[PDB]
């Protein structure tokens, strides 16, 4: 995609220092995260629109027995038939609502 601007780098770096924003709404502190693009990798400002997510909320489906205890622990990118944007939203919040939560936590004006 498009290389980030300096302002995008500053924002992304702030977001990337947060624990998983989806786990956080469930009271769980998951601090090993990667950034997830909500709105692609090319449009202006797209790199400001990223969520810090744990491995299980980003790309990996946890074992079913684990999801029985943590049913909201589903990846925003489907892994087989587990997760995807719609199921992730159902069990958490929309991506843009989580982005607002992340901005609040990182003390970024929004
Ligand atoms: Zn998580
Ligand atoms: Zn992603």
From Swiss-Prot:
Keywords: DNA excision, DNA recombination. Stimulates microhomologous recombination. Enhances the recA-dependent precise excision of an IS1 element inserted within the E.coli galT gene. This is Recombination enhancement function protein. GO terms for biological process: DNA recombination; DNA repair. It comes from the Viruses. One of its GO terms (molecular function) is enzyme activator activity. It comes from Escherichia phage P1 (Bacteriophage P1).
